[PDB]
Structures are given as C-alpha cells and as structure tokens.
Design a protein around this ligand. Structure first.
Ligand SMILES: CSC[C@H]1O[C@@H](n2cnc3c(N)ncnc32)[C@H](O)[C@@H]1O
Ligand SMILES: [Zn+2]
Length: 269
C-alpha cells in the first residue's frame, strides 16, 4: 500500500526526484517499523526528523512523539506535507539541516541525505540528546561503526564512539527506495554513554589530518609550537602515550591519554 500511495502523490505534483539532494524515497514498511521500534518512541519525546520528503516516517513519528521538528529544503516537498497530512505536533523548518538553528530535542529519528551526512552528525555529536536512530549510506554507516585500526576508521568514527555506542540495526536494499539509490542504506542506532570521553576538537582534528601517520609524526607535523620551544618538543614527543600507534589505530581512551600528557607538559593549557 505504502508502495502505491507514494506513486499517487508523484502524479499530483510531478517532482523529478533529483539525486542532487539525495531524493530517494522509502517504500518498505518493515524499515519504518524497525526505526520507530529501535528508537523506542514514547509521547514525551521531542523527535528531530530531517529530510522528511513525502513524510511516511514523519507521520509515524507525529502519531507518537509529543513534538516532532523536521527540516526540509525543497519547498515543493513542504507544501505537500501540509496538505497530505494533518498534524498538530510537527514543526517543519524550511531550509538546510546544517545551517538552520536547531530547536530543543531528546531523540533523533530520520533518514539522513548522503551529501550532509558528515557535517550533520558532527553537529549532532555536539548536542545533548538521549538517543538517535539514523539511516545512512552504507559506506558512511560502516564508517561510524568502524573498529580502531580498521581500513576506514576516521575522525567521525572516533568522535561518534567517544560519545556513545554506535550499532548498525539493519542494512537496507536500494529496492526499498524509489528512485533506486546506487548504494544500499543502513540503520544506525546511537546510544550515548553516561561517561562520554571528551576530546579536544583541535587535537583530534590535527591528529586526523593524515591519519595513517605515527602518533609522533602526526604531532611533529600538526602540533603548533605556540608556547613550546625547540629541544623540549623532541623530549615531549618521545614519552607521549601510544607513540607506537598510527593515528587511525587510536581508541578514544588513548586520545584522552595523549591529550592529558600534552596538557600536563603545557602544550594545550
Ligand atoms: C528522504 S529522501 C531526501 C529528502 O531530504 C530532503 N533534503 C535533502 N537535503 C536536505 C537538507 N540539506 N536539509 C533538509 N532536507 C534535505 C530532500 O528534499 C528530500 O525530501
Ligand atoms: Zn597522509
């Protein structure tokens, strides 16, 4: 039915779905049911959706969460949400997710467009949110989960796991979307820790500049010498914790050890 009642909108408005803003549209139910379940949505939550589109999922959220904000960029999409659905606990914000100032919320339940997967999730990792089920391009999802020292483990993976537990819940075929995306999606639960490891953003950013460097090399190359003088950094680099690891091998905990060690040698405070 969801299959058919999608197409019965596309004749009514006639969007040619641009994969310039990642317009692929879901037509399986047991995906929407897996998100709603995984997020475990009760009616005190203030969900944040993003990229609702035709808004099948937005509908499911709005019939539960006490308030659901949602952010949409194609205006054409947004006037279809106001006409097709009638909601009194949904606030569609016009504009792009990256820039528009976010409201307050506790959970996040959303498909996320590929092109703003990265800057979204970094902004999210800097919020106080209870929980997040989020759908991703597989290559990206695999990144969030990636174990330290693995092929694709990156600054994203680190910052995500340094805040929380990050599990894939299901992989999602392209046949569940119209039009067909080139690559599968994957539904990614993020349960935050109740003892988040809090990494110095700059440090992490400097370390992950070339993330296949040795920790000593990455520091020699990316530590800015604003305070430290010449022959002391040679000493300070010798005893840095985990000096035998490549950056992309570091756990959050070990980035914290390096951060402290640097702190106490007067580099960053
Ligand atoms: C659910 S398929 C993608 C949906 O997300 C929307 N979208 C794409 N990019 C953005 C963005 N930057 N901000 C908000 N919605 C977006 C698209 O217009 C479409 O409705
Ligand atoms: Zn490099």
């Amino acid at each position: 039915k969801m299959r058919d009642r999608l197409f019965f909108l596309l004749s009514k408005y006639g969007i040619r779905p641009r994969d310039s803003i990642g317009q692929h549209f879901l037509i399986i139910e047991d995906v929407i049911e897996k998100a709603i379940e995984t997020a475990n949505v009760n009616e005190n939550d203030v969900i944040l959706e993003v990229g609702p589109g035709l808004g099948f999922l937005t509908d499911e959220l709005a019939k539960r969460a006490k308030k659901v904000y949602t952010i949409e960029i194609d205006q054409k999409i947004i006037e279809i949400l106001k006409k097709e659905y009638s909601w009194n606990n949904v606030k569609i914000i016009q504009g792009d997710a990256v820039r528009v100032e976010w409201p307050k919320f506790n959970k996040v339940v959303s498909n996320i467009p590929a092109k703003i997967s990265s800057p979204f999730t970094f902004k999210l990792l800097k919020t106080d949110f209870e929980r997040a089920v989020v759908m991703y391009q597989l290559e990206f999802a695999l990144r969030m989960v990636a174990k330290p020292g693995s092929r694709n483990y990156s600054r994203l993976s680190l910052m995500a796991q340094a805040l929380g537990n990050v599990e894939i819940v299901m992989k999602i075929g392209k046949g569940a979307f119209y039009p067909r995306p080139k690559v599968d999606s994957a539904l990614v639960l993020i349960e935050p820790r109740k003892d988040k490891i809090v990494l110095n953003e700059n440090l992490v950013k400097a370390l992950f500049q070339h993330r296949r460097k040795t920790v000593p090399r990455a520091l020699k190359d990316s530590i800015h010498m604003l305070g430290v003088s010449k022959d002391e950094i040679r000493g300070i680099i010798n005893n840095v914790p985990h000096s035998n690891k490549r950056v992309f091998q570091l756990y959050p905990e070990e980035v914290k050890d390096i951060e402290e060690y640097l702190k106490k040698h007067g580099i960053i405070s």
